[PDB]
């Protein structure tokens, strides 16, 4: 039991919880975001997670091959999942690059973000303590913006390529390449440290957050709803899609994981444990983040909603401020960023390995015919690194925000989840799926899962998509920068690169099948033996 939970401890916490969830919560007014977060949690998240794991166990193959045994017509779902993973692996590693840059900067007598007396610092800076002793700027925020990021005025101004950040990305990608090539993973005595270190560090960060002299206001802003925020589609899509992204569902990684697990395990209980603790850790780390933000508000004399960036940089603004106020700040900064690097590296290894396995299974005749697999891994790492160079430039933050919003999140996950649940519930048949689950684990899904798949998840996904289309608002970096039309088109292109996979595969298989149209459709709807 303990060993199984420890093996879980590798995968039930990640950057999606520590980093992504807090900034999405902060961006969408805090407490207002929780309502659709929990609604989508119990409506779709756990059932779709269980459904994908069941698919993976039932087929015992990759996320693309299983749909052949389920519904050949909708085989494009696996292709959409693999392209989603491919896009995610490009921009997810930039977080580790920023973490590596912060870790290297932490090897100093004094943390650079503690005070603003350097060459990169604006003359409007004022210390947080003395800011309340105009348009002053906190040293941490502008350290993030100017030193680590060197933020460009817009996406239309890429600027120069930051050599230090490029080297950080190269280091992280080299680590990933060597780990994947040599199959390096936490399996010995080191798994205990690898799993326990994030929660020890998070517990320390949370305890520091709550004990601040202004944590109460931050917690109140974190938990108190604002029902006028639920009238805008953005809080619904962000909260619903965060559930899918955190669980790594709709990516096809879970389908492959289901084929690489020990047998005779109670699948239903394991899925609920994974989901419940994955959501719990996000909700728990929200207290730490928002308590830090509340103390920052009390110190700087500004509103809680304006203290820090409303974007991916929230984790790189709040946490350094927290570690700045602990005894021997350098030690805790080093520990925090090593923790972040390990926590993101394990997930990156998992996703890269899954992508490699999915791609080689598509062409085993050449890719898997011999030692060419290592060359393929090197090719994938190299192409991903070159693609990630675009988000290292001075204007790379806008590209990162666009990628995070569209390429591996947003409407695409809703599309994939809706097609998965619709196919299984209606085309394949909910009764047949329940019969399969009975044969596999011994008991049927129950009314909750069956009705979720049949009604709740499709209704939620379609409602969110239609609500977004009807009440469309453009994406904005932070809350003041408006993206140009071409940038929005590029983001929609990134999303459509995954969404279009299903119709393209459908029409291709319809054209590549003999017989009349009805005969073609019948032959492709009937599951294979």
């Amino acid at each position: 039991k303990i060993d199984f939970v420890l093996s879980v401890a590798g995968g039930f916490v990640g950057l999606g919880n520590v980093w992504r969830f807090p900034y999405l919560c902060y961006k969408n007014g805090g407490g207002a975001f929780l309502i659709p977060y929990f609604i989508f949690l119990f409506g779709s998240g756990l059932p779709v997670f269980f459904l994908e794991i069941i698919i993976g166990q039932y087929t015992s193959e990759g996320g693309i091959t299983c749909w052949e045994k389920i519904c050949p017509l909708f085989s494009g779902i696996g292709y959409a999942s693999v392209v989603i993973v491919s896009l995610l692996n490009v921009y997810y590693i930039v977080i580790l690059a920023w973490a590596t840059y912060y870790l290297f900067q932490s090897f100093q007598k004094e943390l650079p973000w503690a005070h603003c007396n350097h060459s990169w610092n604006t003359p409007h800076c004022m210390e947080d303590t003395m800011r309340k002793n105009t348009n002053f700027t906190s040293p941490v925020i502008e350290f993030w913006e100017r030193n680590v990021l060197s933020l460009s005025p817009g996406i239309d101004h890429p600027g120069s390529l930051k050599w230090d950040l490029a080297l950080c990305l190269l280091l992280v990608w080299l680590v990933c390449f060597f780990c994947i090539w040599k199959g390096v993973r936490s399996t010995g005595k080191v798994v205990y440290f690898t799993a326990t270190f994030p929660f020890a560090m998070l517990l320390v960060l949370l305890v520091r957050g709550l004990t601040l002299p202004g944590a109460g206001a931050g917690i109140k802003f974190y938990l108190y709803p604002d029902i006028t925020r639920l009238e805008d589609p953005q809080v619904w899509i962000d909260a619903g899609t965060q559930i899918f992204f955190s669980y790594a569902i709709c990516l096809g990684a879970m389908t492959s994981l289901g084929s690489y697990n020990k047998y005779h395990n109670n699948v239903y209980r394991d899925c609920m444990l994974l989901g419940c603790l994955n959501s719990g850790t996000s909700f728990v780390s929200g207290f730490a983040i928002f308590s830090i933000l509340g103390f920052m508000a009390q110190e700087q004399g500004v509103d809680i909603a304006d203290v820090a960036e409303s974007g991916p940089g929230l984790a790189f603004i709040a946490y350094p401020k927290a570690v700045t106020m602990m005894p021997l700040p350098t030690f805790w900064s080093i520990l925090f960023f090593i923790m972040l690097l390990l926590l993101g590296l394990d997930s990156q290894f998992v996703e890269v390995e899954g992508q490699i396995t999915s791609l080689v299974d598509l062409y085993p005749s050449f890719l898997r015919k011999g030692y060419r697999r290592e060359i393929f891994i090197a090719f994938v790492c190299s192409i991903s690194y070159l693609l990630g160079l675009t988000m290292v430039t001075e204007g790379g933050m806008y590209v990162f925000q666009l990628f995070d919003y569209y390429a591996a999140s947003g409407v695409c996950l809703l599309w994939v989840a809706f097609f998965e649940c619709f196919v299984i519930a209606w085309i394949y048949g909910g009764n047949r799926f329940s019969e399969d689950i009975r044969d596999m684990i011994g008991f049927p899904p129950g009314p909750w899962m069956k009705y979720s798949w049949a009604v709740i998840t499709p209704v939620l996904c379609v409602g969110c998509f239609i609500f977004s289309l009807v009440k469309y608002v453009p994406l904005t970096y932070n809350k003041t920068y408006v993206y140009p039309n071409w940038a929005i088109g590029l983001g929609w292109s990134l999303a459509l690169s995954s969404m279009l996979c299903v119709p393209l595969v459908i029409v291709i298989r319809l054209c590549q099948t003999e017989g009349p149209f009805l005969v073609r459709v019948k032959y492709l709807l009937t599951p294979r033996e």
Partner: antibody
Amino acid sequence: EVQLVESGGGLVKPGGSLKLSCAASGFTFSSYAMSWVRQSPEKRLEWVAEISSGGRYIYYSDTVTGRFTISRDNARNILHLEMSSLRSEDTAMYYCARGEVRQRGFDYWGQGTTLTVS
Amino acid sequence: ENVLTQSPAIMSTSPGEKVTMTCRASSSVGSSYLHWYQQKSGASPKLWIYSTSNLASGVPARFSGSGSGTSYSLTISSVEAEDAATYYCQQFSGYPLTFGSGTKLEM
């Protein structure tokens, strides 16, 4: 579930054939898997075969793997067991049981019919 | 085939005295996949305990079960006159399904 009743038992000869039936009522027959359990005159229970809710998966005991055929009629809510080459050791009482949940076991059992091969 | 064997085939008993009977399995049987059935004389068997600890609807709290892995047992706190029946252990973990030899409480 309330009622499970078997029927069709009788006297046969070695090498003969017989078809056993089990009518079900009080519950959705199509949603629950069914199994046959055999009780020899020595009172020893032996499992015969299992049919899933939809009948897509069918399981048999080693002794009747190539001899007995289990079938169900969801529309008629009736369970059938078919014997092709009954041997001398097959004389026993057959009960149809509901085995939908493998972790809960056979919730209800039928009255049963005695089978003899004298 | 996973053969299940129950040692106390015949057990004379008097009212009030506690009684425990054990089921032994030749292969690893999961805790949730073992169940006991009660069969009165001249009657079809009825479910008694499932998942090795959960009591069926009709069985009173008088009965309880325990065991894990390869040895299982269920005990009676204070046997009554109505407790005289045959109990069979059954494994549901893997096919073919098998039942125990059975213990007939004669009193």
